[PDB]
């Protein structure tokens, strides 16, 4: 009726090398039973699984609000720099994999 | 989506039938019961384990995953005669739109205290004419019944069991020419393989 | 809990007539994806349920065209427009929107033909079972059309219910007519207490009773 895939957020994130860099993951889950995933893209325009929820530098918090989750990078360096995105796997109802649409770190040099 | 074959247990013990296929489907569980209403117990994740149940199946069923020999189980816990049923397994895709594709065969499950009891076997007797036989109080399921051997099967009725006392009673019907019988023999010959026991009975006027 | 309701049990057809079996929701099953997740199975005996219609209306491939599914909001409708002997059996919709999913109680499909009489026949216990010290009477009702009848004992007149217990054939190949065995069983003692013995089927074909009997 009003439907939302998982959100990833900024769509661009720039920050300089060395400090810690935090994306925004939303899911509103209608069941419990579901895990929420952080990916980035190999080369190869495909999916490596960086961190997930629940679980050394790619960490994933869960906020209090039942919605919203914080996917960070803990003092980034440059080959940081890629494509992420999160994705939620949910078993029922439907049991479905549903990714977001990808975001950009930047990691500038210092 | 091959099961475990048949199961025959004691009310409160438990048992734990298995479905075979790996990584890339939902598994379900789902009881169809000897009123062939058919409820949904559960779904397990094949590469997480992660699992989500109907509330009225919780503490009755659980489900578990082995993934190295790509085989999922449901144990049912402090068994009762509810419990029996046909315990199918099936699978979901991810991301399709539909549900259950592939089934397993089923799993027969029967709980009793009943044992192996041989059935009692009664004539039936009295333009065509109606002959029976009668067969009571037998555990467990199935018995096999004929007429002269095989070669009377037009004009047969044979009843499913029913249950009372914990135990299996049916019926058979057989209907014949005026001008056959008592003329000519008519016999029921029963057979219940769990006991060994095979009976045959003519139908004496 | 969404409890799937379907009218009705059961939908007697001519191959090729047109019968149509509908499923009723207590609530909407509208995912959270905006799709409708609710089924059609189709269950021959002795085997498992075979997908038909997903969604709402979209056929299975290698589904026949002739079935099509169709509802929405509360409201879904399984439509047969040629119904064959591989469509005889037990439909049972479903919705996989809502946990607990849950189905439908089932419409079985049946063949209908003409209209006919059961054939009754009513047997005293055999002496074999006296010696036992129980005492079972057995009545058959045999091929009729529709499945529905009822049957009713009475002991000297006055009705009775304790001890029946009775089984149905499914519709046979041949005549595809219906069969009953209604089975009343006492104790030798109980038995030897009473004297008229009598079963009655009271079928569509009958404005009134068909009566058996007999005196120990
Ligand atoms: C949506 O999910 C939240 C959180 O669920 C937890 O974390 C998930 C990733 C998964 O691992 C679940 O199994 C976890 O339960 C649910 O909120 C929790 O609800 C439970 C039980 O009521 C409660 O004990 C926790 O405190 C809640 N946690 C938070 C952060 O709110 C929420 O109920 C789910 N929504 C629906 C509709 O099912
Ligand atoms: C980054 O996060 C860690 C803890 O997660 C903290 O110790 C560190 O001080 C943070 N750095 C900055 C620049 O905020
Ligand atoms: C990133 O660069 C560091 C050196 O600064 C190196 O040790 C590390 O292996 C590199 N990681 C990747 C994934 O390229």
Same mark, same amino acid.
């Given at each position: 009726?009003?439907?939302?895939?998982?959100?990833?957020?900024?769509?661009?994130?720039?920050?300089?090398?060395?400090?810690? *860099?935090?994306?925004?993951?939303?899911?509103?889950?209608?069941?419990?039973?579901? =895990?929420?995933?952080?990916?980035?893209?190999?080369?190869?325009?495909?999916?490596?699984?960086?961190?997930?929820?629940?679980?050394?530098?790619?960490?994933?918090?869960?906020?209090?609000?039942?919605?919203?989750?914080?996917?960070? =990078? =803990?003092?980034?360096?440059?080959?940081?720099?890629?494509?992420?995105?999160?994705?939620?796997?949910?078993?029922?109802?439907? *049991?479905?994999?549903?990714?977001?649409?990808?975001?950009?770190?930047?990691?500038?040099?210092? | 989506?091959?099961?475990?074959?048949?199961?025959?247990?004691?009310?409160?013990?438990?048992?734990?039938?298995?479905?075979?296929?790996?990584?890339?489907?939902?598994?379900?569980?789902?009881?169809?019961?000897?009123?062939?209403?058919?409820?949904?117990?559960?779904?397990?994740?094949?590469?997480? #384990?992660? @699992?989500?149940?109907?509330?009225?199946?919780?503490?009755?069923?659980?489900?578990?995953?082995?993934?190295?020999?790509? @085989?999922?189980?449901?144990?049912?816990?402090?068994?009762?005669?509810?419990?029996?049923?046909?315990?199918?397994?099936?699978?979901?895709?991810?991301?399709?739109?539909?549900?259950?594709?592939?089934? #397993?065969?089923?799993?027969?499950?029967?709980?009793?205290?009943?044992?192996?009891?041989?059935?009692?076997?009664?004539?039936?007797?009295?333009?065509?004419?109606?002959?029976?036989?009668?067969?009571?109080?037998?555990?467990?399921?199935?018995?096999?019944?004929?007429?002269?051997?095989?070669?009377?099967?037009?004009?047969?009725? @044979?009843?499913?069991?029913?249950?009372?006392?914990?135990?299996?009673?049916?019926?058979?019907?057989?209907?014949?020419?005026?001008?056959?019988?008592?003329?000519?023999?008519?016999?029921?010959?029963?057979?219940?393989?769990?006991?060994?026991?095979?009976?045959?009975?003519?139908?004496?006027? | 809990?969404?409890?799937?309701?379907?009218?009705?049990?059961?939908?007697?057809?001519?191959?090729?007539?047109?019968?149509?079996?509908?499923?009723?929701?207590?609530?909407?099953?509208?995912?959270?994806?905006?799709?409708?997740?609710?089924?059609?199975?189709?269950?021959?005996?002795?085997?498992?349920?075979?997908?038909?219609?997903?969604?709402?209306?979209?056929?299975?491939?290698?589904?026949?065209?002739?079935?099509?599914?169709?509802?929405?909001?509360?409201?879904?409708?399984?439509?047969?427009?040629?119904?064959?002997?591989?469509?005889?059996?037990?439909?049972?919709?479903?919705?996989?929107?809502?946990?607990?999913?849950?189905? $439908? $109680?089932?419409?079985?499909?049946?063949?209908?033909?003409?209209?006919?009489?059961?054939?009754?026949?009513?047997?005293?216990?055999?002496?074999?079972?006296?010696?036992? $010290? $129980?005492?079972?009477?057995?009545?058959?009702?045999?091929?009729?059309?529709?499945?529905?009848?009822?049957?009713?004992?009475?002991?000297?007149?006055?009705?009775?219910?304790?001890?029946?217990?009775?089984?149905?054939?499914?519709?046979?190949?041949?005549?595809?007519?219906?069969?009953?065995?209604?089975?009343?069983?006492?104790?030798?003692?109980?038995?030897?207490?009473?004297?008229?013995?009598?079963?009655?089927?009271?079928?569509?074909?009958?404005?009134?009773?068909?009566?058996?009997?007999?005196?120990?």
């Amino acid at each position: 009726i009003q439907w939302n895939p998982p959100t990833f957020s900024p769509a661009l994130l720039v920050v300089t090398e060395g400090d810690n *860099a935090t994306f925004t993951c939303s899911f509103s889950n209608t069941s419990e039973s579901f =895990v929420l995933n952080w990916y980035r893209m190999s080369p190869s325009n495909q999916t490596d699984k960086l961190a997930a929820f629940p679980e050394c530098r790619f960490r994933v918090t869960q906020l209090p609000n039942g919605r919203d989750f914080h996917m960070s =990078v =803990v003092r980034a360096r440059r080959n940081d720099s890629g494509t992420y995105l999160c994705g939620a796997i949910s078993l029922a109802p439907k *049991a479905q994999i549903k990714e977001s649409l990808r975001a950009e770190l930047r990691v500038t040099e210092r | 989506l091959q099961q475990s074959g048949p199961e025959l247990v004691r009310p409160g013990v438990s048992v734990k039938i298995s479905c075979k296929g790996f990584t890339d489907y939902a598994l379900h569980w789902v009881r169809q019961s000897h009123v062939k209403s058919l409820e949904w117990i559960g779904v397990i994740s094949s590469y997480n #384990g992660i @699992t989500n149940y109907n509330q009225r199946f919780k503490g009755k069923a659980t489900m578990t995953v082995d993934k190295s020999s790509s @085989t999922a189980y449901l144990e049912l816990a402090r068994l009762t005669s509810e419990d029996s049923a046909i315990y199918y397994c099936s699978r979901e895709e991810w991301d399709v739109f539909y549900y259950f594709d592939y089934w #397993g065969q089923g799993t027969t499950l029967t709980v009793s205290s009943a044992k192996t009891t041989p059935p009692s076997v009664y004539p039936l007797a009295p333009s065509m004419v109606t002959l029976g036989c009668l067969v009571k109080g037998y555990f467990p399921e199935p018995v096999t019944v004929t007429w002269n051997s095989g070669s009377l099967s037009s004009g047969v009725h @044979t009843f499913p069991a029913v249950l009372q006392s914990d135990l299996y009673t049916l019926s058979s019907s057989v209907t014949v020419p005026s001008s056959t019988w008592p003329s000519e023999t008519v016999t029921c010959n029963v057979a219940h393989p769990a006991s060994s026991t095979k009976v045959d009975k003519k139908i004496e006027t | 809990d969404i409890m799937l309701t379907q009218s009705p049990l059961s939908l007697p057809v001519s191959l090729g007539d047109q019968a149509s079996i509908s499923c009723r929701s207590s609530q909407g099953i509208v995912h959270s994806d905006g799709n409708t997740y609710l089924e059609w199975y189709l269950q021959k005996p002795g085997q498992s349920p075979k997908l038909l219609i997903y969604k709402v209306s979209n056929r299975f491939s290698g589904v026949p065209d002739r079935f099509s599914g169709s509802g929405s909001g509360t409201d879904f409708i399984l439509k047969i427009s040629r119904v064959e002997a591989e469509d005889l059996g037990v439909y049972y919709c479903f919705q996989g929107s809502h946990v607990p999913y849950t189905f $439908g $109680g089932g419409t079985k499909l049946e063949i209908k033909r003409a209209d006919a009489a059961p054939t009754v026949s009513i047997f005293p216990p055999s002496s074999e079972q006296l010696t036992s $010290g $129980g005492a079972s009477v057995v009545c058959f009702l045999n091929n009729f059309y529709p499945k529905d009848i009822n049957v009713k004992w009475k002991i000297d007149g006055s009705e009775r219910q304790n001890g029946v217990l009775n089984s149905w054939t499914d519709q046979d190949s041949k005549d595809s007519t219906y069969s009953m065995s209604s089975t009343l069983t006492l104790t030798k003692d109980e038995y030897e207490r009473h004297n008229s013995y009598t079963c009655e089927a009271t079928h569509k074909t009958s404005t009134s009773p068909i009566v058996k009997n007999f005196n120990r």
